[PDB]
Design a protein around this ligand. Structure first.
Ligand SMILES: O=C(O)CNC(=O)C(=O)O
Ligand SMILES: O=C(O)CNC(=O)C(=O)O
Ligand SMILES: [Mn+2]
Ligand SMILES: [Mn+2]
Lengths: 326, 325
């Protein structure tokens, strides 16, 4: 059958069904034999923890209660060498091998293809990540501003999934162990947080060969009683706001008045403060008039902008680090 | 209004702010003991000391890297323990965010930021540069500004007034002169400078010389023999940065603006028409909120992140400060 890699994996669900009833809002669980994952380019290289370790020349994130206890409560995660990560792994810390696509770079082709098949803006952030855990490790209840296609490779992993009644379309991460909401999030958080154990969540056991589509914003937590290994393909979720502000900035960056250095008005004398306010009024009027002339075509024309400079910077930095042998 | 005074004397801080900052370079010569006023200066006064304290990836830059990478790149990050090998091959070493290891200097940098009237959120750091054997950086301009303190050796700087772009918002290497980033293209005027910046000012920076290097000024560097310098590097956030931050904060509360965007030419004709009306409506709302913008709201955003490239690198490096390289 002339099928896409994604189609091959979610069969007998069609890609149209996926796009109409699941993406980008509802989770999908697709079960089957792990061998159908072998059409993912580079899968054989990340099929076992020993294989991932043989190729992954980068720092590894470790997360969990052992980190909280060692750090005397300062943090729940460290970035460490692959070797040290194995020491933490034995203490039940979850290991995250981020930007695994640097080390199976053939998957990058596929990811870009999948990004187009999902009709994501070209500029959307995308990567592969490997997650490994044992001894009850994993992640406590949280949500992400990203969506994931999750391919369970080894072991049985317990996911909790709950609808998020507090925020629609979150644009930042949040750990439920913060109960305090960060600034932007505070502006659109509604209602009471869920309990730490997500008591109303759906529990899903992921086994080898299970693919889980995980939409952005769902509350989730993970636990690996025994050793597990999974490969995630992780996508940004650029908002209309992202594209609109990129388009507006493209219209304004040409104007030297907008490129001039900004000034902290705090130290200024009152007359200078007022003059700055009049200068800024001029800018405000011009910004508003450029916003008023914004068109759909211009918004679409900025779909190839960098909407996640945090992810892009982390990719560049990790690429530069490959010159050290971790 | 005091921190720089003893270093740029006889230039006064008022003269510096009115006549030089943020557009024209200044060269202040004097005794290097001046620099003892900077917290932690003793700890970066030789390359040995820097290497003793700097527990982070070190950037190495130059011909030796071009060779090792078979032409792919001129830079990469290595361990402090491997950096000296590259230095001996004439690669320039960049110890980025050196202020992570001399925390003392943060207070100083913050005072300077306040003195210069920079937005509170402006990026700011210390960087040490070391090179020998003709190593350094080829002709380019930065979107950052730098206060440069020459500690050791005689370093050849070329400096050239930028006649092409005012207040650039990104980095540019003169060597890429066929190609121009889209944004830069939209405000570049005229022809790029000539190869090797023939009309440049040549300035030999000797120990105790401080160079103020404004954003956008063309420069390049060469260390014939060993050199060591400390930079204090500041972002240059534009009014556009604060204003778009303020506008985003007004809109991020509205779920319509947080909804997932789509690839235009992936969807059907019916869908392509159905998106136009929704986007026209959103554009109306964006415009209405832009018309509500006040100077107060712009200033209330001065503590935002205007430089995710720098902030991201800082967080990453902070997670590596006790890494066993
Ligand atoms: O895989 C895990 O243990 C945790 N993964 C996530 O939270 C995620 O993919 O967003
Ligand atoms: O110090 C050097 O050799 C090069 N430095 C710069 O380009 C800079 O400070 O912007
Ligand atoms: Mn998650
Ligand atoms: Mn420079």
């Amino acid at each position: 059958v002339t099928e896409s890699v994604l189609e091959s994996i979610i069969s007998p669900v069609t890609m149209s069904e996926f796009l109409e009833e699941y993406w980008p809002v509802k989770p999908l669980v697709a079960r089957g034999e792990v061998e159908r994952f072998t059409s993912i380019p580079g899968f054989e290289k990340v099929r076992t923890l020993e294989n991932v370790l043989a190729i992954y020349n980068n720092p590894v994130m470790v997360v969990g209660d052992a980190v909280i206890e060692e750090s005397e409560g300062i943090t729940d995660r460290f970035l460490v060498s692959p070797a040290e990560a194995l020491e933490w792994y034995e203490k039940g810390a979850a290991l995250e091998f981020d930007f695994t696509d640097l080390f199976i770079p053939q998957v990058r082709r596929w990811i870009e293809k999948l990004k187009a098949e999902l009709r994501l803006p070209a500029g959307t952030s995308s990567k592969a990540i490997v997650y490994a855990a044992k001894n009850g490790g994993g992640f406590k209840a949280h949500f992400d501003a990203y969506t994931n296609l999750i391919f369970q490779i080894q072991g049985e992993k317990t996911w909790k999934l709950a609808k998020n009644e507090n925020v629609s379309n979150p644009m930042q991460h949040y750990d439920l162990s913060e109960a305090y909401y960060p600034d932007d999030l505070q502006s659109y958080w509604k209602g009471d947080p869920p309990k730490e154990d997500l008591p109303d969540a759906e529990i899903v056991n992921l086994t080898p060969g299970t693919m889980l589509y995980l939409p952005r914003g769902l509350w989730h937590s993970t636990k690996s009683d025994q050793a597990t290994l999974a490969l995630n393909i992780t996508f940004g979720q650029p908002a209309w706001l992202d594209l609109m502000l990129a388009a507006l900035r493209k219209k304004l960056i040409s104007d030297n008045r907008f490129r001039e250095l900004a000034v902290n008005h705090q130290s200024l004398h009152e007359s200078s403060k007022s003059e700055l306010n009049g200068y800024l009024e001029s800018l405000i009027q011009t910004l508003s008039e450029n916003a008023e002339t914004l068109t759909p075509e211009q918004i679409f024309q900025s779909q190839d902008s960098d909407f996640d400079p945090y992810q892009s910077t982390q990719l560049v930095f990790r690429q530069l680090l490959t010159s050290y042998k971790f």
